[PDB]
Design a protein around this ligand. Sequence first.
Ligand SMILES: [Zn+2]
Lengths: 111, 69, 103, 306, 133
Amino acid sequence: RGLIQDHISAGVWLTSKDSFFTREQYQQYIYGCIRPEDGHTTRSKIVTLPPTIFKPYPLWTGKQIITTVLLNVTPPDMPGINLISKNKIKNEYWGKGSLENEVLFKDGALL
Amino acid sequence: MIVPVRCFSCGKVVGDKWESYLNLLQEDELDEGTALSRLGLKRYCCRRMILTHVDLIEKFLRYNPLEKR
Amino acid sequence: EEPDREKIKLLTQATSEDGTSASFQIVEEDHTLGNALRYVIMKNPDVEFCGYSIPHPSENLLNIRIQTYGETTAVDALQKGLKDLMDLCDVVESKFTEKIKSM
Amino acid sequence: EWNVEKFKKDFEVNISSLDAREANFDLINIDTSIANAFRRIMISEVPSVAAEYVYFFNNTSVIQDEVLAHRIGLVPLKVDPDMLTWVDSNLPDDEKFTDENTIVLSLNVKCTRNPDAPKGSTDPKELYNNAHVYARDLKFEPQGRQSTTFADCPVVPADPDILLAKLRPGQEISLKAHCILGIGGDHAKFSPVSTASYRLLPQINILQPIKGESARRFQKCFPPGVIGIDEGSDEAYVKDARKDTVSREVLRYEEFADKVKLGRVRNHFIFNVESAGAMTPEEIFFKSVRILKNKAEYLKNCPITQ
Amino acid sequence: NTLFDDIFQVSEVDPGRYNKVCRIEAASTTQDQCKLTLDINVELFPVAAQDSLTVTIASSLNLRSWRPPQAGDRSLADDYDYVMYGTAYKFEEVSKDLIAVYYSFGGLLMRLEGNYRNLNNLKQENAYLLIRR
Ligand SMILES: [Zn+2]
C-alpha cells in the first residue's frame, strides 16, 4: 500500500533541492495537507520550522515541507525517525558532484 | 444531431454561425479557414466546433412520418 | 435577516482557549474567497500562520485556520482580513471606474 | 509597510480596448489571488438570466424534447439581469413564478409546405414554410408590471440567428419557457461571459544584444511587432512584449537560447473579458468586484457561530 | 556566537541540472586545508568562479519560534548577504587531524573540510550560515 503515478512524480518534483517555497506557499501547502480539526495531528495547534534561507527572502525547501508534515503527524512525546534509505534515481542525473540518492532522515527531518 | 448552440470548451454562442458559414463555403467560394476567421471563431475550441460539424439532422428529417410520401 | 448562524462555524476541535488558534468553517465557498482572504490575512503582521483547505470539492465547504500570537485574536485577525478585502475591492472598483471615465 | 493605501498607490489599471462585447484591460500590481478571484467570479458567480423550465405542449419534430429544452436553455437572452430577483424553492410552484422573478417566452411554430418552389430542394426555406426554427422565434410574453418595465427593454435573444430546430411539414413545436435568474456556477447556461481569462504580461529579457541580420533574424522568430529593430547596428529591441504569445519558438535556435530569457510579470495581468451579449463586459467586471466586496461584507456581518 | 569565519575563493560553480541552485566548490585563501562544497540558490545570490565569499558559521543571529524581520531590530544577518539555517548530520575524518563537517539546509548541503578549526564547530542542532560578497 503506497502512493501511485502522479503522487510519485509529485514527490520527485517537490523534494528536489530546486523546489523553494515562500512562507505563504509553505504554510498554505501545510494546512492544505494537515487539518487539526480533523484529528490529523497530535498537537491541537500548528508548528512550523525556520526558513531554509533567512536572507534576501525567507525560503523553505520541499524537504522542509516533508519535515513539517512528519513533525506534525508524529507524537510530540517521541523523537524523529532516523533512516538512511536510497532512491531509484542515480546521483549522476543531478550533476557531476550532486549527491541525491542517499535519503537521510535525522530526528524527523529529511536532510 | 444539430449544430451545437455553444462551443463546449470556450462558451461562445456558435449556433448562429452555421448557415452563414455554409453559405460562405458555397456562395463566396471561400475556404474553411478563412470562413471561420470571418465568423470570429478565433479560438480552436470554436474553430473546431463549426469546422468538424456533421449536420446529420438533414439525413434524419427525410424520415418524417407525419407527411405522405 | 437573522445573523447567519450557519455560514461560519468555529471548530472547537481546532480552537485554543487562550485565544490565538482557530479553524473556521464557511459553507458554500472555495478558493474564490479563500485564497484572496488568506492572501490579505498574511498581510497582518500579527498572523503567525494562516491558510485554507477544502475538505472535499463535492462537499462545497471551506476551512480557514488562523493561529496567531497573543497580540491579536483569530476572530479579530479574520475581521482584519475582511475589512482589508472590502476596502481593497473598493480601491479596485474606484480605479476601474476612473479609467473607464478617462477613455 | 503594507497598507491598503500603499496598494492603492501601487495598483494600476490600463484599459487597452473596450468594445460593447469585449474588454481587454490590465490590472497592474495586484495579487494573483485577486485576479483569479475576479475571473472565477465573472465566470461562475455573476448572475445571468437564462431559460430554465421549458413547458412543452406538443413536439412532433425529429428532435428530442429534452435536447430541444437544453438548447433553448443555452440561448443567451439580452436581459439586464437586475430586472429580476431570485426565485426561491421553499415554496409552491404557484408562488415560485411571478412577474418579479420569471420571464415567459412562447414558441408556437407549425411547419408547412410551400406552394411549389422552382426545381425541388431549392433549399429548405423555399420548399417549406417555417422550416427553420430560430431563437428569433421566441416571442416574449410579459405579465403586467414587467410588461410596462420592459416597454423600453423588450426581451430578445442576444443572437436571434441561432438555429434552434429544423422541422418538416406537419411537424409542430409549442412550448413555453420560463427564464429565471441564475449563476454560471450552478449551470454553465447562466455564465454571462463567453471567455473571461487573464494572462501574465510576457517579459523578454535580452541577456546580450543581437544585431544586423541575426537581430532581424531573431525578430522574425516572434509575432510580427513584438521585436522591433530601429537600426540593428546597436540593438534589436522589443516594440511591445504584450503582442507575444509565448510560443517559445525562439528557443529552437542556439543563436538565441543562450542570449535570451523568457519570463512574465507576476504583478501585471492582462484580462480579456468577452460578453455573450446579456451584459457589457465591463459591467460584468463591475458586478464581479462588487460581488467579492458584498461577500466580504456578508462575512463581516455574520456572527461567528460555535 | 561565531564558530567559524573565513574569506573563500570560489574555484567552481556547477549548476548541476537545476535552474536556481548551484554546487559551489571553494577553497580558503587563508588556510590550505580549509575546503568548502556548498549548494546555494544563485538566483537569490549569484556567484561566479574565482570570486570572494566571506563565509561565517555562527550558532545564532544573536548580537522555539521565528519572526519575519522588523525594522525595530537587527541581527547578525544585517552584516551579511546570504543566510541559511541548517543542521549538521555527518562528521568524517580525513586524517589523524583532517575532519570534514556536513550541514544540510533543508537539503542544501555543505561540506567543510578542515582538521582542527572544527573544534569550535562541533555538531549542533542548528548552524547559521552567513555569506558576504
Ligand atoms: Zn470555442
